[PDB]
Amino acid sequence: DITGSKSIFQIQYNNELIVWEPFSERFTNKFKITRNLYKNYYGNKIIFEEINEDLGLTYRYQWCSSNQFGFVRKSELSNHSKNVYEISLLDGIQNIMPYGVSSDLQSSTSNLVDAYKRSELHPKSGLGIFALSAIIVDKAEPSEALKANIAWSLGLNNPKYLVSSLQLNHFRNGKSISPEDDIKGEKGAYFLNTVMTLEANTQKEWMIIANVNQDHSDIIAITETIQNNKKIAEDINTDIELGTKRLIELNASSDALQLTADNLRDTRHFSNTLFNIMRGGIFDNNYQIEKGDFSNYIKKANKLVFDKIDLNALGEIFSLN
Amino acid sequence: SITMDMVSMNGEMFYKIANNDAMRPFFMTIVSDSNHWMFVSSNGGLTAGRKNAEYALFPYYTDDKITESADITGSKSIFQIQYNNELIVWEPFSERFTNKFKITRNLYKNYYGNKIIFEEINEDLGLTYRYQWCSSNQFGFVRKSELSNHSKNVYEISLLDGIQNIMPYGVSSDLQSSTSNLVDAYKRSELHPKSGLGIFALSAIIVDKAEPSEALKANIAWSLGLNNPKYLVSSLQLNHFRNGKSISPEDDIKGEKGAYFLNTVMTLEANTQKEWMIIANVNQDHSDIIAITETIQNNKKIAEDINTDIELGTKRLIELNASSDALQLTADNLRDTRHFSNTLFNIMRGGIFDNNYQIEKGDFSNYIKKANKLVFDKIDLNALGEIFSLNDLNEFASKQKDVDFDRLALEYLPLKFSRRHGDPSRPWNKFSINTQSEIDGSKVLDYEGNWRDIFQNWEALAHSFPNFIDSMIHKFLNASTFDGYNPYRVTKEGFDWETIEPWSYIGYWGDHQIIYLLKFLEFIEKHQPGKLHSYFESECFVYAAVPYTIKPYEEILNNPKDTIGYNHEWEKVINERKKSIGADGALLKSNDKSIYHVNFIEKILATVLAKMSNFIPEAGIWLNTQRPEWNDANNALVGNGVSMVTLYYLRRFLKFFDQLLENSTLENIKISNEMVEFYHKVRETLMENQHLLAGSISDTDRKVILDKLGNAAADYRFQIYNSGFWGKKRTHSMQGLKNFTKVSLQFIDHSIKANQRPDKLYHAYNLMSVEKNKEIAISYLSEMLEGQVAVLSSGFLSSKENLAVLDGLKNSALFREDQYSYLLYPNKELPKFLDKNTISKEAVSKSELLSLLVSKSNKQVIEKDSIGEYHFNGEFNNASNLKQALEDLSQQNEYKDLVAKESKTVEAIFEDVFNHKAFTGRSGTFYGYEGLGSIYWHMVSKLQLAVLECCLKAVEEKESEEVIGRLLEHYYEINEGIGVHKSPSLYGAFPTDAYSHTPAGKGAQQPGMTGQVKEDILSRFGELGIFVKNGCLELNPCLLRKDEFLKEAKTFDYVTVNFQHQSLELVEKSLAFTYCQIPIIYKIANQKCIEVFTNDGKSAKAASLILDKQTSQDVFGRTGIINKIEVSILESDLR
Ligand SMILES: [Cl-]
Ligand SMILES: [Cl-]
Ligand SMILES: [Cl-]
Question: Which of B288, B983, B988, B1069 has its CA 20 to 30 A from that of B227?
């Protein structure tokens, strides 16, 4: 309810404002709903889905990974009713950690950490910066926090932004929010607020991207991309699919791929193999070895041997043979 | 919408916050007379237990997580209500059914702070549900439930009500915090069918050892008041019921969080109410559980016995608090309630005396045994009874002719009820309420506390028990070191010092000595004039052996952050003496004796000379002892920081001492031979530099003076660390000491005059640096509240100057508008993330190294972003990270030379970007606690007391009524800021409860045991005109407002010194309070008069409001001779 994905919709139906908060337990048995959960055959994507059967509205969000961009939350709001709906939506992620809090400190002393939080919005780009005012340390010495966690968005028109969960309940109670760009002392969050007309038999999509361990240069690169790169959505989707492709290549090298009459068995063999190579490893490239890695390994193993053996006769890459 | 009213609930008065759910949830401590603790949010989320976190009923987490846990932990109630042919589900206090019903939520807390009620009105159904938490020494926690039908309908209701996420016995708070999932696998919750009692245990105590580990205790919950209940011992079916279905009884659930739920079906008629209770307790063995099961089955009056024990709890709470003058009755119950809670939080932290001035032989005898085995063997306590007074002990001691017994007898403090101030909002502090023996639950007479916290609490406590002041003074002095400092903690047994575990080091706090000692010395001289004089030549004081070596002066000057080593060899000798003697083994010996004894004059010189040895003219007292002063958040000022704050209080200390010496008729003093050189070198340094005070002091002369003072201290301590005290003393002139005090005051006064700002505020903390190794330069820091508090406390400024300071303060950046009170230092905008760390293009291009690193796309030190701006590497926290990176670069051939050439240049660019030379600590770099925009209430209340003392000075010296009036206006406004009359939404909690701080973005944070309360106790006594001077009590308000006086008749229920609960009838135009637990009634009258009523049935009247010394001693001595005092006050003297 307080951490991760959160979505609230204010829907004009008749001359009534109706509030729907999918995946929450905030409105028990208010609506007939169906919840479905999806996971892909490779295990690297998951979709949460709620159908509001009273409104003929479905909300889905999907988690994907991107080596380049971090985590990508892809959202779809689908109107399969015969009605046109005026919807004001608040959607995003909450209890975003700032960079540089140890897991130990967050576990034992979360309240103290809050006093060091500062969440900001970069106005031009809509990117959210989740940082500390200082790295928390016992020493009586300066301790600058020069990295951040981030979240940003594509696909919604002229959004208002929150960088905290302070106004979430106000929205839940059918009221409108004020934009935030600088909140101190509170759990980080990243929410988009937009108003849209969702026609019958139509679907609206958007995505939120979040990443960790970002320095000033990393953040400027994203802000520039948001402003100048017309194909940024495509580049994100390309990097997601590259991820799947690389996952398949790793696993397939350990005989993960089978096709029988029974996809459950085929899928289980895939995941078995993945969990095996995740724990024990997979070979880099068949029986191929790199001179540089091998040379470093010998250096650490036995300095006498490393001094004595001349590896010049071997190429930059060579086989086990 | 959010109002606060007084409301009777079942015949008991509570404060009610209406619509409490419109406030951001706030955190509370529910107090007990016993060993209960309970930390609860206004939303219902809680942790609770007995003694400490290792006997938690509900899991012990930080206050954010407690607040966030309300849906799954603690109280839970679901009602299935048949109306029409519809089953309607209502879950009060939950967020499960948002806006399903029109509801009102109200929160109640009683005047004593030991009961809380949560209430939800379902306005659509005309149904109200309330539950109340109470404590019982015998039974544990009691949750009293009421379901009230105020509709015109009859309802068929099936209810599920109880408590969930009940801890099993024997889970450590550490394990529950870090590994709660593993704990679940060991849980087994059971129901005892015959009784309905729930048993919450582990299958085994969780341990790393490969050994059996039986879990032979449990937590329990049981119930009264419901007919034929079904029971759940888990939350597994909660959601089934939430969805309108019926439940199956449970009596054995493994692997799941414990819960205890009752299910019954009832017909609730119109205009009727149903009641029940749940009782829960911790740390129960098989015998304990059988006793409850038997009681449930056979004891017809068990409900009454529970209610009796709850009320006994309240009564005992009142008796404890009343003994420290907690009970007042004025026209304003908010003020009366705040005074009650202030006093409670004071005695909770510092303790309360067991029984007036009464001492038990057994406790006392055990204390002597632990203190000094030689003394214990030698002293025959037969002549004393099983119980005896402080006076009886003094008389007994006077006959034994043993100075070590004198000291131990005097130091004895029969305190109880103290505990450390840890809680979910102060999770770095471990707490344990160790007030009942583990063997038989009898009272425990013990105490422990951090130096500053406990001596602060005791100043307020002493007012109610004045004859213990000598005890406190000796405890303080005798726990001080020869080099003028003290260990970090005091205990009944003696004292504890910090040890070294890293970047871990020990030290001494600069503020610990002067002001805290002074308040006690001021107290005794008011109550017992001449008593301090009687100790001038009495060699009954000792020196605490704390094994810290303060380094030579030249090493301190060289690096004033590296100044104190732990002496492990000294430690071994102490531990050996402790085995051989007891606690007294931690006292310095001499060449001659096991325990070295000195007089009061020597003890004062020890602490004064240590401070003066760190005196930097025009700057203050150097902070160079590896610990800060009061403000931990400015802890990086240790090293080059200098305290004007301590100098201001030293001015007050030395003026007091100057007058004390002047009133003496002793012609000589007697001090350790070793101290003579030190005392003389310091005195001489000041005498021969006094000519400089005609103007300002150069940086050259500043160093000449500090070098002489510092070298003198260093030679003294070197001699004692290496050779010890030889045991000989020398006779010197009293005139010479008066000369020393006078010249010390001349230097301090000159320094004060050099520390006024243009805005009329005073400097709090300055910086020093050593220049051309021949000069000491001073620079200045921001305006700080603490400086204003200290200079206004100094006694140095005139009334007009005090008022100019306070006018400056009101108009300064320290005034925070929304709460109309004071910050510690200005709020400031910190740089936003993308503004923190940019290197100018010019600086990069002018550096060959940085330009080369950019060229080669090396990112170890500097990186260039895609709009062409330059940044230091994002991993750097400070210069030490930069240095390390430059050394890594210097391993590479192409960088080696440039790194050697430009390292200093690059480091200077770093310092230019980050300005770390200006860092004073986390105070300027965070947004809670002592941080930016935060009001830290203890310091505001110290300001209030200082302003009061300024008001009393102006009245006394007969300033113009304009000056008196303007000073009083400051007093009343500061008091308003404290917030007792604010709305709950502005205060952010119950305004009658103290909290540590209010940050910029939230209401009050950290409930209860703040040191603020001791200041507000003292200010309240000042307001009521309770003054002691020349051994005489005066009851004569000059600052008290007319509106404090009652507008209607009221009954004052109070407790006498002999624990009798009695009543007085007050009329209009009067009020009441107690002092030394005597009730005092003020009444408005045509003529001043005091009337003393004695237990012989007589009374005695005079026009003077100053009592004589003998009558005053009868008050202070708590002998029950005086029954009450009535004081007739002029309307024209009220404000
Ligand atoms: Cl502690
Ligand atoms: Cl303490
Ligand atoms: Cl001696």
Answer: B288
